[PDB]
Amino acid sequence: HMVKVGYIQMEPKILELDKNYSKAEKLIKEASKEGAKLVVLPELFDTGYNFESREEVFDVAQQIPEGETTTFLMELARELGLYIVAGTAEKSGNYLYNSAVVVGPRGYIGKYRKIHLFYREKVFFEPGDLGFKVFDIGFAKVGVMIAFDWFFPESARTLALKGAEIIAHPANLVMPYAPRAMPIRALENRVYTITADRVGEERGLKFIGKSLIASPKAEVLSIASETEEEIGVVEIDLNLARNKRLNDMNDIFKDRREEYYFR
Amino acid sequence: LVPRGSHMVKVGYIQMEPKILELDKNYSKAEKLIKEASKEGAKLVVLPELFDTGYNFESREEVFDVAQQIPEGETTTFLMELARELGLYIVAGTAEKSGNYLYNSAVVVGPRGYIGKYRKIHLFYREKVFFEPGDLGFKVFDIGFAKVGVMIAFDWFFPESARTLALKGAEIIAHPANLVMPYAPRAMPIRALENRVYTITADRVGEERGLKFIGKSLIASPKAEVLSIASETEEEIGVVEIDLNLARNKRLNDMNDIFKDRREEYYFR
Numbered sequence: 001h002m003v004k005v006g007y008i009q010m011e012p013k014i015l016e017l018d019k020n021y022s023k024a025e026k027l028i029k030e031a032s033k034e035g036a037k038l039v040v041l042p043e044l045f046d047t048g049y050n051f052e053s054r055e056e057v058f059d060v061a062q063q064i065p066e067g068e069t070t071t072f073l074m075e076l077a078r079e080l081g082l083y084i085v086a087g088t089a090e091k092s093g094n095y096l097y098n099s100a101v102v103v104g105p106r107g108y109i110g111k112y113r114k115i116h117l118f119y120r121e122k123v124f125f126e127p128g129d130l131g132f133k134v135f136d137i138g139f140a141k142v143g144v145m146i147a148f149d150w151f152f153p154e155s156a157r158t159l160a161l162k163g164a165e166i167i168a169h170p171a172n173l174v175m176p177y178a179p180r181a182m183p184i185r186a187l188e189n190r191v192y193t194i195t196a197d198r199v200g201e202e203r204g205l206k207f208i209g210k211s212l213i214a215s216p217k218a219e220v221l222s223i224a225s226e227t228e229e230e231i232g233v234v235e236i237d238l239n240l241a242r243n244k245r246l247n248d249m250n251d252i253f254k255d256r257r258e259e260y261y262f263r
Numbered sequence: 264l265v266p267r268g269s270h271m272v273k274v275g276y277i278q279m280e281p282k283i284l285e286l287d288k289n290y291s292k293a294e295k296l297i298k299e300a301s302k303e304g305a306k307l308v309v310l311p312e313l314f315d316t317g318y319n320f321e322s323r324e325e326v327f328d329v330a331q332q333i334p335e336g337e338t339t340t341f342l343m344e345l346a347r348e349l350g351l352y353i354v355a356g357t358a359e360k361s362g363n364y365l366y367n368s369a370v371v372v373g374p375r376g377y378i379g380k381y382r383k384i385h386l387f388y389r390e391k392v393f394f395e396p397g398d399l400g401f402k403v404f405d406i407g408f409a410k411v412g413v414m415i416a417f418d419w420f421f422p423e424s425a426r427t428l429a430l431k432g433a434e435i436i437a438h439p440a441n442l443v444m445p446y447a448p449r450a451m452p453i454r455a456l457e458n459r460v461y462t463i464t465a466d467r468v469g470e471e472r473g474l475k476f477i478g479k480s481l482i483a484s485p486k487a488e489v490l491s492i493a494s495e496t497e498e499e500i501g502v503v504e505i506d507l508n509l510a511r512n513k514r515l516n517d518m519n520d521i522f523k524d525r526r527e528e529y530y531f532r
């Protein structure tokens with residue numbers, strides 16, 4: 001029930017997919033050498049984020065799972081024998097999704113499409129349409145949400161109610177709030193959260209770094225720098241997320257009272 | 264001579280140390296501090312959870328024999344007289360006697376009298392020994408200048424509590440509390456942020472029959488700003504002037520309205 005997990009905090013170079021593959025591969029191998037069995041890459045790690053036109057991301061975005069971002073992550077996951085959640089610009093026909101792929105030592109596992117688009121993402125991407133999915137990676141159930149999804153408590157809650165024990169959270173954070181909020185997201189759902197942020201400035205847009213892993217007890221287990229590329233790997237106890245007990249008289253999920261919510 | 268604009272109101276928490284089972288002494292303390300808040304211009308004040316009875320009961324008979332009915336009982340009427348006298352609105356936690364049942368409740372009173380009540384939906388720990396789980400739902404009360412939602416202590420742990428209040432139009436969430444865990448001061452700015460509302464957590468202080476409350480009453484803005492936070496141990500008030508337009512405007516930026524951006528068809532399914 002003890003597993004080592006980690007984020008990959010990296011600086012995507014916008015439109016330079018290959019360079020971004022090489023950087024992700026370098027850091028994931030570092031995380032692998034620290035024993036990470038699950039690693040999370042930031043939102044849109046392959047394409048970067050601050051596009052000027054839909055055309056410039058459309059011209060580089062890859063298809064899932066045939067495209068080269070997914071196939072690259074598949075080869076790396078098979079080579080290292082770990083699981084990867086990574087944000088990627090999804091090409092699907094004539095459309096773009098702000099997505100995340102999940103891959104493991106045996107290949108593609110599935111994808112999530114960002115349900116809550118943030119700001120100018122609505123210019124480029126279609127709203128996610130696959131719902132909030134939880135993926136079985138053998139030793140854990142991992143839910144996936146992307147960046148702004150954190151702002152809506154319903155995102156983490158839906159994943160957690162579907163059995164997610166870890167929420168993998170690729171992010172390109174620009175607002176200051178998520179590092180303060182994610183321990184609450186972890187605590188209120190009694191899950192672990194892995195927020196893999198990017199760093200850097202991109203056409204004048206500053207990302208905040210501060211990738212962090214939070215425990216079901218709102219403990220910040222690891223937090224990254226504001227500006228530097230780095231990994232963070234920690235050993236987590238999945239029993240602490242499977243057991244929703246707060247004390248001998250409160251089980252968080254058994255204590256929910258759906259009849260009084262949203263009505 | 265110039266306008267200031269905005270829809271301003273001064274709101275406040277009352278951080279006090281209830282004496283368990285000593286209801287009249289607790290009324291006097293509440294009056295003293297609420298008068299201080301009123302002299303600072305507060306128009307809405309929040310008292311802690313179970314401000315009249317205290318919290319850490321040894322038995323249900325202990326609290327049942329002093330608990331007051333709502334709104335006929337002594338706590339509501341005391342708060343009613345006080346709100347009329349000072350011309351303000353009070354939200355206050357109180358043990359509610361209802362037939363042979365006990366509820367962990369909050370009353371809302373204004374200058375014109377009793378407004379309504381809320382019954383704590385999520386009971387915490389030993390409260391399940393003494394209180395019935397609340398059954399009225401999460402309610403929003405119109406106090407003229409603002410719509411106020413009410414939730415009590417451990418309700419904060421469940422994001423659905425504040426979310427339900429805000430989706431029902433709450434611009435302020437009044438939050439009587441007797442906090443024992445360390446988390447609420449860190450979480451309440453997130454509750455305020457994610458719903459774009461003001462939150463007023465009115466915590467008690469003190470050690471009560473071994474159980475230590477954490478104080479740290481706090482008012483948080485729709486931008487997760489801690490506008491006022493209290494000490495761990497002392498009795499005190501905190502009054503701040505808030506712009507209700509900031510709660511009414513759900514636009515985080517010019518392409519993101521928090522409520523219009525919700526996509527319920529993907530939630531809880």
Ligand SMILES: NC(=O)CCCC(N)=O
Pocket residue numbers: 043117118146147148149171172173174175176177178
């Ligand atoms: N990539 C994004 O969704 C940015 C908004 C989220 C944030 N906390 O800045």
Ligand SMILES: NC(=O)CCCC(N)=O
Pocket residue numbers: 312387415416417418440441442443444445446447
């Ligand atoms: N009075 C209570 O509900 C205590 C549990 C909530 C807390 N944060 O301590």
